[PDB]
Amino acid sequence: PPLRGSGDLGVLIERADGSVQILDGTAKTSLARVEGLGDLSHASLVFSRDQRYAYVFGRDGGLTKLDLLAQRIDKRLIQGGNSIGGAISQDGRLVAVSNYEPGGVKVFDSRTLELVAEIPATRLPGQDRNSRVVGLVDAPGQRFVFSLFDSGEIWIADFSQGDTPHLTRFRDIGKQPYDALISPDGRYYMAGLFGEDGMAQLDLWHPERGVRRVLGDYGRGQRKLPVYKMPHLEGWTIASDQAFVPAVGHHQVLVLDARDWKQTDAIDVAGQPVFVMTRPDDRQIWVNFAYPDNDKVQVIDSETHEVIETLRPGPGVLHMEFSGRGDQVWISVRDADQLQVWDPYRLKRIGSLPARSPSGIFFSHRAQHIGL
Amino acid sequence: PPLRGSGDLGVLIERADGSVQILDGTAKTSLARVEGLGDLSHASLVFSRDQRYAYVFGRDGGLTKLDLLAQRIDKRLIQGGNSIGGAISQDGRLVAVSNYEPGGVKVFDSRTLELVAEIPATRLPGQDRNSRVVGLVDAPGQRFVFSLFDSGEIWIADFSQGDTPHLTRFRDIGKQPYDALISPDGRYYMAGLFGEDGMAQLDLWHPERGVRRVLGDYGRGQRKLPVYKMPHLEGWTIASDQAFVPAVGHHQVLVLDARDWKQTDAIDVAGQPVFVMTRPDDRQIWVNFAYPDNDKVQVIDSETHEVIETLRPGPGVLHMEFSGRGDQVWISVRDADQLQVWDPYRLKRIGSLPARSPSGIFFSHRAQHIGL
Ligand code: DHE
Ligand code: DHE
Q1: 3-class secondary-structure state, position B367
Q2: B343–chain A Cβ distance below 8 A for any pair
Q3: What is the DSSP letter of B245?
Q4: Would you call B47 an interface residue with chain A, using a CB distance cutoff of 8 Å?
Q5: Cross-strand bridge partners of residue B285
Q6: Residues B164, B176: contact at Cβ < 8 Å?
Q7: Distance from C-alpha of B362 to C-alpha of B171, rounded to nearest angstrom
Q8: Where are the domains of chain A?
Q9: DSSP state of A96
Q10: Measured between alpha carbons, how far is B143 from B141 in angstroms, rounded to an integer?
Q11: Which ligand is nearest to the Cα of residue A246, counting in written order?
């Protein structure tokens, strides 16, 4: 195809056919459909630092280096036991992916997808297995950070000095961390706890100070909810003074003081929130919901904490993505087979695109952001 | 040329020969030199939202739409009296350039450079011309915000409704505002005052509240300094709680409290700071200086406020720019005819490219952020 910029290119997961659509953000058009990515029933992706490639992580353990400008699979591998939610290094040269079988982290060359290092997780007793790994993120200083669900640990893999990483292991951080996130500035790593309440906070500027428990009331409490009903921590959105986050098993969006990490408000919403995101200018908070309320998107004023409109794009709204500067918000409607574009300032739809069971929608500006 | 991504492309201003270099950030090489941009003795630029084009604003009033993938001038126009420091709109369709003769702001279409809107400044009660316009920035909500030097006014031009802007005028904001910045979140507009000490702050979320005076001790005061010794308000760095700024006429970098806008610390530096910058992880402050100390760059620990090291890349260090994720910092060394690439974590030079009197260095990741 002809020359084009990479700044407005997006990748849409088509959930039921293992295919993706490459999108032109400015024109609001579909450039192509690419097939052969296997099981994208649940998928995540990151972008290369030049924004030409997407690294697609599938639930079949597949890692697809997708060439966005040539509209083709550049390279692809499949490793059973590889989880999704992988990350790309600060210098863009390393792609890290979690695995539950055996249990650990594998880091690959971003250019050739050749294995660079394997970090086995802590061994478990009575099993030919290691601990499951969750909450994998990239971090400043050529690091990856991740948590061990079964053993209760947060590890730092430091690749500053080349292909052999230097590990820093923190034990006894909390029972069963199920997920984690990295703060926008890349300073604080926080893993949510499933076997108990609170977050395991790690100051990456001062790892020597250890791990800190914060937000002690947040969690399943004494409720016996299964681990797959715990929130997506990518569904958190953190701002300067506040964080807007999904409640655990309640129809509330919690407002947290981000300096002391304590809840100060709870906004009643039309369902169990999954993803709580912010308009890039931080004025509004956008929320999607879990079934049976997953036909709605609610917009919340970040100042008054009040719901200002309830959108109904259609059945099965799974994911939302804003543009770099915020002139657009993209909303995938799975069971309508549409990818809708909306004006987040006029709260009006500005175009739809046919898609087959669309789910995740990602835009290449993520390439420039730690933790994305 | 061949296919490539736009996410790592840099544009270097060669201020002596009316030329620029297009740089491959990942390969740390030069892709091309493009000539014929006239007077770049002083210049700035912004990127289109797909990152394929740069809009260079020259001292000659020239506005060049440079094609970084075809490595050629796509469109150019020259309008005497135009200033540099133009901005691009939130949806990317409008490019604004300020005027100093007669005084005002002109807005062009990003694709054709055809004129869209002429906004003349306040006519001066006496002369045949208007106030000079200074401190033009893009803001969320499809707005352009600028200050009127002679009149002491802050205007907001709102293109939300179309080509005809809705203007909001704030008068008696302070004497002779010479420059302005917009906070990284896109909420606060701050104009520095030359006719009197202090800064005029405007809350773009709540324009009904009007302009407000802050940091009343920042300025020349009793000293008879010229405009052109006042600081580059682009030389400010605003962290979430703190601001790192150049002192006015002093060899110091001031640490301020961004919430209360009061000075909490002062840092003795090796010269008059011009640009105070932050590594993208906010753990370091990078400082360059004006003649005769402009052969130095000082790296400050953002926490201890102590100088970690003093770099000496060469004579005539004019500007610096980081990669989006912080793995690189690019440093222009005018009198050595070198654009250097450093590792900001190892603090060691990893590249040095030839250039003709290099000055400003800009990378495509600015395309995604308000105010850049
Ligand atoms: C680790 C992980 C990511 C990648 C985040 C990252 O790092 O970028 C992810 C992404 C997602 C993304 C978008 C990609 C992203 O990374 O943000 C969406 C829309 C999503 C909607 C759901 N997820 Fe997801 N999800 C899990 C884990 C994850 N989901 C589970 O363990 C759980 C509870 C069990 C499972 O089914 O796998 C789970 C169930 C769901 C759902 O039930 C949702 C709501 C609807 C559905 O169809 O599965 N998950
Ligand atoms: C408006 C403006 C921009 C655009 C900022 C933006 O939006 O990116 C700019 C950019 C710059 C940039 C980088 C481009 C950028 O986009 O910031 C640098 C390195 C720079 C180094 C100087 N500037 Fe600059 N500069 C002025 C105004 C400006 N300078 C002046 O009015 C003043 C005081 C007199 C003049 O000649 O214009 C002035 C003198 C200087 C210098 O003396 C400096 C320190 C050294 C030199 O010019 O050789 N200015």
Answers
A1: helix
A2: no
A3: E
A4: yes
A5: B278, B300
A6: no
A7: 34
A8: 1-372
A9: E
A10: 6
A11: 1
